[PDB]
Design a protein around this ligand. Structure first.
Ligand SMILES: CCN(CC)C(=O)c1ccc(B(O)O)cc1
Lengths: 237, 300
């Protein structure tokens, strides 16, 4: 059924699965027209597809040309997401097809179910977890590839870099979600924390700096402090 | 006018004939129903006084044979049988009539209700939904499941309604997923009407039969089918103008006939609010919307 805190370790078993987040597929800036009305201008977006066990991020880049002459774009964006996820499953061999796809927003259930009718054995599930994947566009190299794209494209990032060599995927996912929650809550401060020290330098192939085990403990603590700080600022606590 | 004689009435029972009903007391001198209008299918149905479990009954057309009812004390129910000896049958009926042992089908001359509820229902099509080929009449009861329900248990005893499933490969063309899911016109017009039913009359006949089995037997799967067939039309942007006007009339008479006190179990709030207020046809069912808003405004 749905995915929540009780069956949480299922995310890290050996049944291949992906998280699909559509919150950055259809992105707009709102502005005033010369006549004083309001209009939107689309900008490039992306589909965030993550294998939580391996850390691979299969980012589809959604180029603004896909919206040209279309209506009801917020609704279309859900069906375009489902179409692209189905097409990635279709491309893969039988032994790489995911046994489950977990959508971060319930509005994706029917579009994905309908596009995946050919795959009755793949479970399409919602989640009770509030995951901060919308902040993926705060990771500089992901935002750069999306905004520079001149055409549709799907680009591989490794959101756990080489962490799996040293930690389990349960721990890696916890670290990712803490980093993304912090970037969502106060992006400037989170990036300040991540980059303050110019000597542990985020390597050319990396998103996340090459922190030692001890430095990650310190970073993770500083991110918790940022989240707690912002919570206090928000609610006057 | 035709007759369905009863051998006897050994157990106390509420007997329905189409939209009418009456009580028969244990061993009361009751020998059946006369003056049944020729030209329509009919249903004669039963609910035992001592065990309201199992409503059951029989769909029949008096033009297709001479039918009577006889209680079976072994299987414990009133059974429909056909009499092949026509002279015997006429002779029995005439005696019961002369002794005034029969209730009269109480049709008011002004009243077209039964016609309006069965306009498209034909005995030949009932016998394809209800499979028992050795009889000319069809038994239905409150517990019989539909073929679709059995996909989700005896098949000889199923209601073989046409399966409707909005998230099925039959409903959705590869490459037209959003289009076909948000606008059911393909499923309705090409798959169902051209492909399976052939015409809108056969579609409406199954819809009307499903409603009547839901109402008269409390058959849950029939209620599901009735709502599915309504939603399929209302959720299609492209429906022939004559189908919409006829659907409005069909539904009007169904809502008009429904017992007010069964409204809570026979009407799906989601389906009706979607159909009347959100669907493509939200403005095409004026008569139905008017009776629904005046009779069942709670549901909405
Ligand atoms: C569903 C997309 N794919 C295929 C690219 C995966 O999720 C995947 C499957 C298996 C491995 B593995 O080496 O165990 C890594 C990644």
């Amino acid at each position: 059924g749905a995915m929540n805190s009780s069956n949480y370790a299922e995310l890290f078993n050996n049944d291949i699965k992906l998280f699909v987040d559509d919150t950055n597929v259809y992105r707009v800036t709102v502005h005033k027209t010369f006549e004083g009305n309001v209009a939107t201008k689309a900008i490039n977006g992306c589909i965030f597809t993550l294998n939580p066990k391996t850390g691979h991020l299969f980012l589809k880049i959604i180029h603004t040309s896909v919206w040209a002459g279309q209506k009801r774009l917020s609704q279309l964006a859900k069906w375009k997401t489902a179409e692209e996820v189905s097409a990635l499953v279709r491309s893969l061999p039988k032994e790489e097809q995911p046994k489950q796809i977990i959508v971060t927003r319930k509005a994706m259930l029917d579009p994905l179910e309908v596009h995946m009718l050919d795959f009755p054995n793949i479970a399409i599930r919602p989640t009770e977890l509030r995951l901060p994947f919308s902040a993926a566009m705060s990771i500089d190299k992901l935002s750069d590839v999306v905004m520079k794209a001149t055409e549709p494209q799907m680009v591989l990032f490794n959101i756990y870099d080489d962490w799996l060599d040293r930690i389990s995927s349960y721990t890696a996912f916890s670290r990712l979600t803490l980093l993304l929650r912090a970037l969502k809550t106060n992006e400037e401060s989170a990036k300040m924390i991540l980059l303050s020290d110019p000597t542990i330098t985020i390597k050319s192939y990396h998103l996340w700096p090459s922190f030692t085990d001890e430095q990650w403990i310190t970073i993770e603590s500083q991110m918790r402090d940022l989240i707690l700080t912002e919570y206090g600022r928000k609610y006057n606590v | 006018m035709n007759t369905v004689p009863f051998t006897s009435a050994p157990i106390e029972v509420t007997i329905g004939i189409d939209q009418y009903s009456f009580n028969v007391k244990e061993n009361q001198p009751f020998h059946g129903i006369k003056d049944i209008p020729i030209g329509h299918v009919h249903v004669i149905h039963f609910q035992h006084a001592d065990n309201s479990s199992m409503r059951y009954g029989y769909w029949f057309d008096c033009r297709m044979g001479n039918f009577y009812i006889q209680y079976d004390p072994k299987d414990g129910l009133y059974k429909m049988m056909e009499e092949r000896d026509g002279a015997k049958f006429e002779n029995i009926v005439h005696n019961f009539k002369e002794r005034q042992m029969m209730v009269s089908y109480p049709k008011i001359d002004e009243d077209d209700t039964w016609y309006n509820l069965t306009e498209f229902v034909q005995m030949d099509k009932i016998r394809k939904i209800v499979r028992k080929d050795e009889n000319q009449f069809s038994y239905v009861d409150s517990s019989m499941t539909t073929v679709q329900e059995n996909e989700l248990s005896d098949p000889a005893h199923s209601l073989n309604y046409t399966v409707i499933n909005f998230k099925s490969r039959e409903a959705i063309r590869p490459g037209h997923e959003m289009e076909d899911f948000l606008d059911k016109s393909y499923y309705l017009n090409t798959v169902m009407l051209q492909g399976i039913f052939k015409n809108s009359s056969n579609y409406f006949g199954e819809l009307q039969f499903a409603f009547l089995n839901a109402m008269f037997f409390g058959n849950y799967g029939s209620s599901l089918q009735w709502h599915a067939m309504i939603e399929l039309i209302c959720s299609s942007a492209t429906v022939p103008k004559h189908m919409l006007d006829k659907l409005d009339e069909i539904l009007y008479y169904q809502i008009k006939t429904l017992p007010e006190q069964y409204s809570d179990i026979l009407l799906n709030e989601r389906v009706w609010n979607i159909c009347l207020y959100s669907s493509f046809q939200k403005n095409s069912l004026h008569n139905t919307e008017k009776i629904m808003e005046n009779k069942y405004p709670e549901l909405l």
